[PDB]
């Protein structure tokens, strides 16, 4: 009923602590009763979900029939909530989801690559990586916006 047609990262690459700016375009054929509920989550531990950070949320409505778009500007991750500071480095994940009346119907995961000034992550193994004294203000990200993994869920809409 609602299909995302494109998501485009406006500011890439960016500082780790710069907000995320996504221009999301979607299509919908009925004038839905409720708002769309959007969410951006930083995955702080790939293993455990207890370090996920809901960076920000945004309601978008009301929804007319057609193809519409909006900008989602989301706050950056909070570094105090990571298990260790060196986890920001390398590939981490964010998930962009939308729910309708608190039921997730779509989820778009993205790999994000993080690098620090002066530091050659490619020649290092996990041990030496932990040892890294991370200056967060020197860490930049690039979101592989070209390779999203999309997951869909069946929900009740205005029925």
């Amino acid at each position: 009923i609602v299909n995302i047609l494109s998501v485009n990262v406006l500011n890439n690459p960016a500082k780790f602590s710069d907000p995320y700016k996504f221009e999301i375009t979607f299509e919908c054929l009925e004038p839905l009763k409720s708002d769309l509920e959007w969410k951006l989550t930083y995955v702080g531990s790939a293993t455990s979900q207890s370090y996920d950070q809901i960076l920000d949320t945004l309601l978008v409505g009301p929804i007319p029939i057609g193809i519409n778009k909006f900008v989602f500007e989301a706050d950056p991750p909070n570094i105090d909530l990571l298990p260790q500071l060196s986890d920001v480095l390398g590939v981490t994940v964010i998930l962009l989801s939308c729910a309708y009346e608190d039921n997730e119907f779509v989820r778009v995961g993205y790999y994000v690559n993080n690098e620090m000034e002066g530091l050659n992550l490619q020649e290092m193994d996990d041990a030496e990586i932990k040892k890294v004294k991370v200056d967060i203000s020197k860490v930049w990200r690039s979101i592989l916006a070209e390779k999203p993994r999309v997951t869909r869920f069946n929900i009740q809409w205005d029925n």
């Binding site: 995302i4 047609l5 494109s6 998501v7 485009n8 990262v9 778009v108 916006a145 070209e146 999203p148 999309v150």
Partner: peptide, 5 residues
């Protein structure tokens, strides 16, 4: 959902 350009 790839970007446009």
């Amino acid at each position: 959902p790839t970007p446009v350009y």
